[PDB]
């Protein structure tokens, strides 16, 4: 209802185009149905550009990492560590909304410094985990909220 990511389209990414289990769309649907309701990639870093169903004024940004979906629940070794959110401004320029460094938590729930109005948003995964033996990008949901 209030998460405004679901229905978003992928407009660009820096990952080889590839069918198709646990694709990018997995983190857009806002659900944790099962192990298959995430995005996972063997490429340990990269970015995703999405276009929301409409422009939104975003105040809050939530990421459900692997631990939130029941993977490595005890230690969080599979949880995304460094990752940033960018937005495309009115002039068409990408601007940094929020940088995260050193995360280990299952869920990151971040209020933005200020409300940001944009339709196109970018997630950049810098460091995909916290030293799990089975390294991968594993993101259950990318969620954002208006006031
Ligand atoms: Ca999901």
114 alpha carbon to ligand 1 midpoint, in Å? 26
Q: What three-state secondary structure class fits 30?
A: coil
Nearest to 118 by CA among 53, 63, 48: 53
Would you report the helix, strand and coil content of the chain in percent, each value rounded to 5?
5, 50, 45
64 alpha carbon to ligand 1 midpoint, in Å? 8
The Cβ of residue 37 has, within 10 Å, a number of other Cβ atoms equal to 17
Give the N- to C-terminal CA distance of the chain in Å, as an integer.
13
Contacts within 8 Å (CB) and 24+ apart, 22-25? 24/48
The Cβ of residue 89 has, within 10 Å, a number of other Cβ atoms equal to 13
Asked whether 75 and 134 are in contact (CB, 8 A), the reply is no
Q: What method did the depositors use to determine the structure?
A: X-ray
Asked whether 120 and 86 are in contact (CB, 8 A), the reply is no
91 alpha carbon to ligand 1 midpoint, in Å? 31
Class of domain 1-147: mainly beta
The data reach a resolution, in angstroms, of 2.0
So where are the chain's domains? 1-147
88 alpha carbon to ligand 1 midpoint, in Å? 24
């Amino acid at each position: 209802a209030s998460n405004i990511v679901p229905g978003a389209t992928v407009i660009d990414s820096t990952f080889p185009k590839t069918e198709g289990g646990e694709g990018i769309e997995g983190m857009l649907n806002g659900t944790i149905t099962s192990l298959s309701d995430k995005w996972s990639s063997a490429q340990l870093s990269g970015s995703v550009d999405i276009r929301l169903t409409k422009p939104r004024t975003v105040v809050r940004w939530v990421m459900d990492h692997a631990g939130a979906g029941g993977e490595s629940v005890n230690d969080g070794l599979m949880n995304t560590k460094d990752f940033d959110l960018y937005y495309k401004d009115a002039d068409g320029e990408w601007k940094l909304a929020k940088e995260v460094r050193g995360n280990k938590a299952h869920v990151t729930d971040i209020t933005l410094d200020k409300p940001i109005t944009a339709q196109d948003w970018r997630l950049n995964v810098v460091t995909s985990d916290n030293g799990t033996p089975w390294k991968a990008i594993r993101i259950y949901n990318w969620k954002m909220y208006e006031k």
